[PDB]
Design a protein around this ligand. Structure first.
Ligand code: SF4
Length: 355
DNA sequence: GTCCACGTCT
DNA sequence: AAGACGTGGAC
């Protein structure tokens, strides 16, 4: 608001220029490359992302190349990062850019914001870093920093609250170098102004911070500690040939873990067991199996639910037509398919049990 | 174990 | 709105 913004900016950027970290997506400011990195970093920590970004870009060097890829290739590249919709949207958006915008990522916030997977944070991030457009790039990190600097006690969960912080950015932003400013802000929240025990002693902008002066940084920002989970018990069948082929299946185009492959499963609700599994299997494609007592139970967390998995090894005797989205996959071909992490562990637990 | 990441869409 | 949508880095 009021506020010595000009020198705040000089302190922040001075720090950022010096203390800046080595990240592959910083090695240049190609809008495609920048855009990929910001999609990968969504709800994902920087260290996690680094090898993904490197492999992805290596496999899909240009915007054009991502557009020409089969959806499944792109999914496999994303295997493990989570929030798999991001990659379906990125793929789609890049096709639109190739057709509608002739391969070049739009530097107008409205054109860009209309693309799939691109929300307000990503508009600011990508366009400021890659094009110097002075849009705010407000995310969790920035709101933490700003909530502390200006002692803003709004629930960081409310839709309206990001808009409040964006306005604060608009006011204090350094329009000379919006990209640098934006990233500095973000990287400060990321490395220094951390959720617990921020490193205020080392903070380039300590002198401007109200939270610090009032000794309340650690009770900011305010966010609902939001409860629940929903536990979801789930039986999983790892069924093999005499021939080494394994029965796997492809999840639906939408909903949870869209288009990923899995070992066949169903929700046991209680913990009755392989019975429903045996029924499944049978009820589908002929298929008579002999399931043989669970080899492991383990939990697997999603943001909005937990799978309680129990995995049943089993043997196959045949099944007229296995069709639909099911498949008999030779063991050595399992690596070609994209599995959610849950089922990669299912397979790991399984392959172990039968050394 | 907990928290929440360089959030978006509905 | 408020809830769906994955996973692990860093404590
Ligand atoms: S002083 Fe402490 S709280 Fe204020 S910005 Fe720097 S790190 Fe965050």
């Amino acid at each position: 608001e009021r506020f010595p913004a000009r020198e705040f900016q000089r302190d922040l950027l001075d720090w950022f220029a010096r203390e800046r970290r080595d990240l592959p997506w910083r090695k240049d400011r190609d809008p495609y490359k920048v855009w990929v990195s910001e999609v990968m970093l969504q709800q994902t920590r920087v260290e996690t992302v680094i090898p993904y970004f490197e492999q992805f870009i290596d496999r899909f060097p240009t915007l054009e190349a991502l557009a020409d890829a089969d959806e499944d290739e792109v999914l496999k590249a994303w295997e493990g990062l989570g929030y798999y919709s991001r990659v379906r949207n990125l793929h789609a958006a890049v096709k639109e850019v190739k057709t509608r915008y002739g391969g070049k990522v739009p530097d107008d916030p409205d054109e860009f914001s209309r693309l799939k997977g691109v929300g307000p944070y990503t508009v600011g991030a990508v366009l400021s870093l890659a094009y110097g457009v002075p849009e705010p790039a407000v995310n969790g990190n920035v709101m933490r920093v700003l909530s502390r600097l200006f002692l803003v006690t709004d629930d960081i969960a409310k839709c309206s609250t990001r808009k409040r912080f964006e306005q604060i950015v608009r006011e204090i932003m350094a329009y000379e170098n919006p990209g640098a400013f934006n990233e500095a802000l973000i990287e400060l929240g990321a490395l220094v102004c951390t959720p617990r025990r921020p490193s205020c002693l080392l903070c380039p902008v300590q002198a401007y911070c109200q939270a610090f002066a009032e000794g309340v940084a650690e009770e900011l920002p305010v966010k609902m500690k939001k409860t629940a989970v929903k536990q979801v018990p789930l039986a999983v069948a790892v069924l093999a040939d005499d021939e080494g082929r394994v029965l796997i299946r492809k999840r639906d185009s939408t909903g949870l873990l869209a288009n990923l492959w899995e070992f066949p499963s169903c929700e046991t609700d209680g913990a009755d067991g392989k019975e429903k599994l045996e029924q499944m299997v049978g009820e589908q494609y002929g298929l008579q199996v002999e399931l043989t007592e669970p080899i492991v139970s383990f939990e697997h967390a999603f943001s909005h639910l937990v799978w309680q998995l129990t995995v049943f090894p089993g043997r196959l005797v045949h099944g007229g037509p296995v069709e639909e989205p099911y498949r008999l996959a030779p063991e050595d071909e399992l690596k070609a398919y994209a599995f959610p992490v849950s089922h990669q562990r299912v397979w790991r637990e399984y392959k172990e049990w039968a050394s």
